[PDB]
């Protein structure tokens, strides 16, 4: 009769069903472990979250759970089970049990050089999942290599819907946020450029520095690029800077597929109104060997929070989380 499991200090109370726990990753208010499921006889992923001390985290937790419960797609992580205390008073932690993936794009690009065909295949799958997300009228807002999970057969699944909506990792952040579905396309362009070189394309240290990196490759902005209700400090700064020449894609990425760079160019478009859309991305020549619109499903209906979660006190959100996960409790 073994007690509570433990990984790197903190307790994982996942009972007799889930054992053999092993560290695989972490977040701002939780940790993800692999575990042996003694019912399905496979290893699974278990995401522990402890968000109740903060309203923002309770929001993120509830959003993710709701979205993932609803969503059903081959390239998006699902939820198989949820564990928490039998009463709300003892609920200090929530455990989301999910399909175990082998690794993520972050770690893979750390150790491995991708061939053009695998770059092409990963990008196809990113866009195939994103299409579904966007068809549901949801924005992911935090697309980046560590939120892309992979298995042995090169299948890919998008994870971490905490920031998702009907403040994020700066390197992959669209320019307009620092100055809509188009923000997710920018992030995907950033990811594509990273698969092509194994390095982040715009590794900025803070918001203005982030804009500086983007402009150091795209060149100084046109007036039409800039006229868009920008923050006054940013606009004053951007106007102050010396001219920057555009660096040609084929010079940043010397051995890259020419079709890949054409799509890159269309994703990394400064003006969000000019930037390529997910369905258009899928239909670009570069993805042609994989493009199959009868095998790229959309969500059954757009997603909707009928409660305005932003205004809700964290005690109310905790009650909602208790209610949302009741369906998984014994009985
Ligand atoms: C759900 C999942 C399944 N399988 C794997 N495999 C894996 C990934 C990297 C290395 C080795 C194996 N990972 C996951 C998973 C990865 N990240 C998350 C996740 O939701 N992370 C967020 C931060 O990105 C998070 C974690 C804990 C608390 C709050 C947020 C789940």
CB 181: neighbour CB atoms within 10 A?
A: 16
Q: Which of 56, 59, 78 is nearest to 69 (CA)?
A: 78
Structure tokens that stand for 309 in this block: 């979660």
* Contact assessment for residue 7 and residue 25, using Cβ atoms and an 8 Å cutoff: no
Domain count, the chain: 2
Same domain, 109 and 48: no
Same domain, 200 and 227: yes
CA 75 to chain centre: 12
Structure tokens that stand for 234 in this block: 């940013």
Task: Supply the DSSP symbol for 58.
Answer: H
- Which residues have CB under 6 Å of ligand 1? 24-32, 45, 47, 49, 77, 98, 100-101, 103-104, 107, 146-147, 149, 159-160, 162
Residue with CA closest to ligand 1 atom 20: 160
Spatial distance between the Cα atoms of 65 and 8, rounded to a whole number of angstroms: 25
Spatial distance between the Cα atoms of 245 and 36, rounded to a whole number of angstroms: 54
Task: Supply the DSSP symbol for 237.
Answer: H
Spatial distance between the Cα atoms of 218 and 210, rounded to a whole number of angstroms: 13
Q: Is residue 25 a known part of a binding site?
A: yes
Q: Which of 281, 294, 278, 254 is nearest to 120 (CA)?
A: 281
Residue with CA closest to ligand 1 atom 6: 101
For residue 167, the number of C-alpha atoms closer than 13 Å in the C-beta half-sphere is 13
Same domain, 231 and 88: no
Same domain, 140 and 126: yes
Spatial distance between the Cα atoms of 191 and 148, rounded to a whole number of angstroms: 10
Spatial distance between the Cα atoms of 284 and 73, rounded to a whole number of angstroms: 22
Name the residues annotated as catalytic.
142
Same domain, 68 and 164: no
Same domain, 85 and 231: no
Q: The domain spanning residue 274 has which CATH number?
A: 1.10.510.10
Spatial distance between the Cα atoms of 206 and 213, rounded to a whole number of angstroms: 10
Same domain, 53 and 195: no
Structure tokens that stand for 319 in this block: 């009650």
Same domain, 76 and 151: no
* Contact assessment for residue 274 and residue 265, using Cβ atoms and an 8 Å cutoff: no
Torsion, CA 317, CA 322, CA 325, CA 327, rounded to 10: -130
Q: Which of 188, 178, 254 is nearest to 215 (CA)?
A: 178
Same domain, 147 and 228: yes
Same domain, 183 and 291: yes
Residue 321 burial by CB count (10 A; 0-12/13-18/19+): exposed, middle or buried?
Answer: buried
CA 35 to chain centre: 23
Q: The domain spanning residue 80 has which CATH number?
A: 3.30.200.20
- At residue 280, φ and ψ (nearest 5 deg) are -70, -45
* Contact assessment for residue 56 and residue 316, using Cβ atoms and an 8 Å cutoff: no
Long-range residue pairs from 218-224, CB within 8 A, at least 24 positions apart, any chain? 218/246, 218/247, 218/268, 218/270, 219/244, 219/245, 219/246, 219/247, 220/244, 221/270, 224/271
Query: What are the counts of helices (DSSP H) followed by strands (DSSP E) for the chain?
Result: 11, 10
Same domain, 105 and 237: yes
Pocket test for ligand 1, best of 8, 22, 25, 45 (most atoms within 8 A of CB): 25
Query: Residue 249 contacts by C-beta under 8 Å, 6 or more apart in sequence?
Result: 256, 261, 264, 265
Spatial distance between the Cα atoms of 92 and 57, rounded to a whole number of angstroms: 13
Residue with CA closest to ligand 1 atom 9: 103
Report the atom number in ligand 1 closest to the C-alpha of 162: 30
* Contact assessment for residue 21 and residue 34, using Cβ atoms and an 8 Å cutoff: yes
- State the residue range of the domain holding 116: 101-312
Same domain, 283 and 261: yes
Residue 230 burial by CB count (10 A; 0-12/13-18/19+): exposed, middle or buried?
Answer: middle
For the chain, the distance separating the N- and C-terminal CA atoms, rounded to the nearest angstrom, is: 24
């Amino acid at each position: 009769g073994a007690g509570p499991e433990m990984v790197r200090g903190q307790v994982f109370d996942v009972g007799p069903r889930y054992t053999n726990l092993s560290y695989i990753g972490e977040g701002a208010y939780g940790m993800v472990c692999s575990a042996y499921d003694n019912v399905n006889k496979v290893r699974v992923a278990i995401k522990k979250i402890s968000p109740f001390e903060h309203q923002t985290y309770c929001q993120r937790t509830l959003r993710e759970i709701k979205i993932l419960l609803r969503f059903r797609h081959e390239n998006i992580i699902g939820i198989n089970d949820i564990i928490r205390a039998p009463t709300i008073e003892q609920m200090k932690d929530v455990y989301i049990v999910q399909d175990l993936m082998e690794t993520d794009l972050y770690k893979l690009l750390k150790t491995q050089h991708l061939s053009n065909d695998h770059i092409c295949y990963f990008l196809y799958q990113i866009l195939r999942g994103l299409k579904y997300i966007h068809s549901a009228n949801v924005l992911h807002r935090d697309l980046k290599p560590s939120n892309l999970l992979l298995n042995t057969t090169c299948d890919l699944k998008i994870c971490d819907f905490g920031l998702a909506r009907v403040v994020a990792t700066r390197w992959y952040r669209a320019p307009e946020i620092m100055l809509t579905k188009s923000i997710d396309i920018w992030s995907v362009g950033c990811i594509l450029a990273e698969m092509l070189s194994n390095r982040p394309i715009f590794p900025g240290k803070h918001y203005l520095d982030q804009l500086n990196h983007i402009l150091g490759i795209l060149g100084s902005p046109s007036q039409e690029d800039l006229n868009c209700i920008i923050n006054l400090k940013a606009r004053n700064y951007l106007l102050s800077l010396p001219h920057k020449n555009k660096v040609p894609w084929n010079r940043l990425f010397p051995n890259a597929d020419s079709k890949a760079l054409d799509l890159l160019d269309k994703m990394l478009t400064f003006n969000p109104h000019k930037r390529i859309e997910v369905e258009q991305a899928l239909a670009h020549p570069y993805l042609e060997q994989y493009y199959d619109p009868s095998d790229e499903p959309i969500a059954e209906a757009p997603f909707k929070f009928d409660m305005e979660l932003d205004d809700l006190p964290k005690e109310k959100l905790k009650e909602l989380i208790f209610e949302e996960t009741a369906r998984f409790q014994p009985g």
